[PDB]
Amino acid sequence: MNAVEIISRDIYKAIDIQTKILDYMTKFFTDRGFKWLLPIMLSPITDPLWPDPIRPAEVDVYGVRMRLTHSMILHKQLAIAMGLEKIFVLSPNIRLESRRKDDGRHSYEFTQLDFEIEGAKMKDVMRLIEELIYGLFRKAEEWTGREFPRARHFKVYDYKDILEEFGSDEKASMEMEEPFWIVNIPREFYDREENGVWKNYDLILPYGYGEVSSGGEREWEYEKIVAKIRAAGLKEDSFRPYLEIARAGKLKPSAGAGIGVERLVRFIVGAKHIAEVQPFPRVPGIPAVI
Amino acid sequence: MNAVEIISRDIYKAIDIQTKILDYMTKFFTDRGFKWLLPIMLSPITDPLWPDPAGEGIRPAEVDVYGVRMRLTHSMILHKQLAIAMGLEKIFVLSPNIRLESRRKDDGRHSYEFTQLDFEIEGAKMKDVMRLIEELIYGLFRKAEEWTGREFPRARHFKVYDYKDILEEFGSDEKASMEMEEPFWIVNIPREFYDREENGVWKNYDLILPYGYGEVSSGGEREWEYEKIVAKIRAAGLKEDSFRPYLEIARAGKLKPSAGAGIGVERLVRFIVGAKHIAEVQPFPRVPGIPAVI
Ligand SMILES: Nc1ncnc2c1ncn2[C@@H]1O[C@H](COP(=O)(O)O)[C@@H](O)[C@H]1O
Numbered sequence: 001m002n003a004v005e006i007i008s009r010d011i012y013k014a015i016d017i018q019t020k021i022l023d024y025m026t027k028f029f030t031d032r033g034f035k036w037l038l039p040i041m042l043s044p045i046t047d048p049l050w051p052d053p054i055r056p057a058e059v060d061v062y063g064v065r066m067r068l069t070h071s072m073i074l075h076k077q078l079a080i081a082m083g084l085e086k087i088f089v090l091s092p093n094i095r096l097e098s099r100r101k102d103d104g105r106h107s108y109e110f111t112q113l114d115f116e117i118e119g120a121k122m123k124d125v126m127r128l129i130e131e132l133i134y135g136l137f138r139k140a141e142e143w144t145g146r147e148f149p150r151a152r153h154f155k156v157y158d159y160k161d162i163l164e165e166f167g168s169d170e171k172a173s174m175e176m177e178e179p180f181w182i183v184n185i186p187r188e189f190y191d192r193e194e195n196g197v198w199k200n201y202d203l204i205l206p207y208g209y210g211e212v213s214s215g216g217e218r219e220w221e222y223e224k225i226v227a228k229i230r231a232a233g234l235k236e237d238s239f240r241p242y243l244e245i246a247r248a249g250k251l252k253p254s255a256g257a258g259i260g261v262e263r264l265v266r267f268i269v270g271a272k273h274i275a276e277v278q279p280f281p282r283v284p285g286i287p288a289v290i
Numbered sequence: 291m292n293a294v295e296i297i298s299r300d301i302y303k304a305i306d307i308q309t310k311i312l313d314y315m316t317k318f319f320t321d322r323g324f325k326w327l328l329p330i331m332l333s334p335i336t337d338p339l340w341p342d343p344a345g346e347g348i349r350p351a352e353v354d355v356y357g358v359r360m361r362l363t364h365s366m367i368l369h370k371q372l373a374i375a376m377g378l379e380k381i382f383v384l385s386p387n388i389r390l391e392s393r394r395k396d397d398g399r400h401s402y403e404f405t406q407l408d409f410e411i412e413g414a415k416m417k418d419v420m421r422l423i424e425e426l427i428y429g430l431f432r433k434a435e436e437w438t439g440r441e442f443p444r445a446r447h448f449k450v451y452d453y454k455d456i457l458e459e460f461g462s463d464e465k466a467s468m469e470m471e472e473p474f475w476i477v478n479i480p481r482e483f484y485d486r487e488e489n490g491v492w493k494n495y496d497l498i499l500p501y502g503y504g505e506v507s508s509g510g511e512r513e514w515e516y517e518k519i520v521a522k523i524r525a526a527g528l529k530e531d532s533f534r535p536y537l538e539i540a541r542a543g544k545l546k547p548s549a550g551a552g553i554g555v556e557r558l559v560r561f562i563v564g565a566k567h568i569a570e571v572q573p574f575p576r577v578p579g580i581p582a583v584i
């Protein structure tokens with residue numbers, strides 16, 4: 001698609017739905033006393049996205065190598081350390097994944113509504129996301145006149161049982177008709193692990209649409225954080241100012257999640273490919289024309 | 291300042307105010323039938339920010355994506371015009387920008403990363419946009435009195451000055467802001483190719499805050515005609531090559547007359563909390579010429 005073809009697509013209904021979704025979700029959080037933060041796109045530190053079942057793009061800023069935002073996870077933990085209590089942000093992310101990830105669900109630029117709550121536990125956040133999704137689905141039925149999944153609470157699968165029964169979260173999505181949780185997934189250092197149990201969670205949409213939200217409780221203790229980083233083969237100086245805050249003992253227990261906005265729009269409009277809900281497509285492996 | 295000093299600052303009140311401002315502004319637009327778009331951060335093309343009397347001529351930060359040069363968003367102006375070309379009629383976006391301005395721009399009003407609420411309206415004229423901004427600002431200031439218990443400028447509409455006359459009377463827009471006690475408009479400012487120019491008159495506008503706080507909003511009617519646009523690019527010494535896909539759209543006759551503006555969120559927060567320096571309202575400061583530690 002050249003530039004003219006890109007702007008010649010019909011996208012009005014998807015954008016109409018997107019506007020209603022953003023209105024609903026931002027209000028959901030401000031109604032519950034969340035602070036609305038603005039994003040950052042450049043920092044000496046960012047989410048490594050590893051280990052996880054790709055290097056961040058970099059640019060020089062006044063002589064210092066900065067990373068483009070993979071995700072604001074570390075900055076959300078810092079906002080909690082500043083005592084903001086409950087926060088969310090509409091955060092753009094840049095993830096330059098390969099052509100292989102062009103599966104209809106991935107974009108190399110996207111936005112997630114990313115939130116964090118001081119002191120929250122995994123079951124708190126999951127219940128909160130269930131409340132958000134249930135309400136959103138009921139409204140979407142009014143917006144679109146179509147029927148959406150009806151459950152107030154979603155089945156919870158352990159990561160292991162998903163690999164056991166379906167082989168992958170992929171096959172799982174295709175087989176289900178309700179959103180479902182996958183919990184206890186070994187991954188990045190910031191996610192809390194206790195007694196071999198990872199206190200984290202992914203919300204998977206039915207009908208093959210795949211993951212829509214992901215989060216967890218956080219590690220906040222210096223020794224434990226550095227251990228997981230070293231163990232993973234990550235370099236500590238990639239996270240220096242963060243670890244300095246951790247060493248100072250200023251990180252606080254918290255839990256949160258990110259919700260992929262375009263993935264949600266795609267589900268509600270029922271679009272075959274995520275690019276169809278984006279005015280300026282950002283397809284993995286295909287550098288954007290505009 | 292270092293990481294621990296940053297996280298130790300007390301900015302709860304500014305963030306509480308920011309939350310109320312974002313709630314108010316986004317509702318203002320959706321209430322009026324505007325569509326809410328998500329931002330783009332990388333693109334082959336971006337706002338040149340030049341010519342522009344308010345800038346020094348910075349080049350966008352660049353990064354390769356699958357081997358192809360992309361520019362980090364200076365502003366989404368060209369993308370707003372393309373959204374209008376897609377028939378979305380009335381649009382807004384909370385758009386983060388990256389502008390690596392020099393230390394000379396560290397005047398308390400600039401940050402090298404910031405967000406603007408950027409909006410565009412198909413068919414609108416400068417008077418329509420200016421009046422909509424007045425409606426938004428007046429209503430915001432009335433709410434701010436309740437949020438803070440302090441007094442804010444009460445004007446329902448703001449006075450209008452030509453740029454040329456500002457220079458003559460005050461010497462600069464900075465001096466003008468220091469002398470005024472209510473917000474005011476500066477219009478007819480020769481600048482970038484996308485602002486509409488007709489027989490020597492630029493159809494554009496900056497909202498300036500009083501008490502030295504400076505500019506908080508800027509916009510204009512747009513050019514949409516290929517030959518007019520190309521001539522302005524060439525006259526400024528810019529390169530058609532830098533705007534190739536946009537110029538393809540323009541050559542095809544698919545740009546439409548429109549007008550819009552951007553409103554600096556952090557600048558507005560700063561004004562309402564009375565902060566000396568914009569860094570005081572940002573959880574992670576981005577001070578011009580100083581690479582941030584976090
Ligand atoms: N490449 C991508 N394209 C579109 N959406 C994404 C992408 N990666 C993540 N998301 C969304 O953002 C959410 C948070 O992702 P994460 O930061 O990876 O845990 C996911 O649950 C998805 O909804």
Ligand SMILES: Nc1ncnc2c1ncn2[C@@H]1O[C@H](COP(=O)(O)O)[C@@H](O)[C@H]1O
Pocket residue numbers: 365389391399400401402403404405406505506507508509552553554555556557
């Ligand atoms: N460097 C900056 N730091 C903070 N806010 C800015 C900066 N540049 C522009 N703004 C705000 O964004 C609005 C739109 O800017 P512009 O795209 O330059 O017309 C301005 O009116 C300011 O309120």
Ligand SMILES: [Mg+2]
Pocket residue numbers: 342344481508
């Ligand atoms: Mg300007």
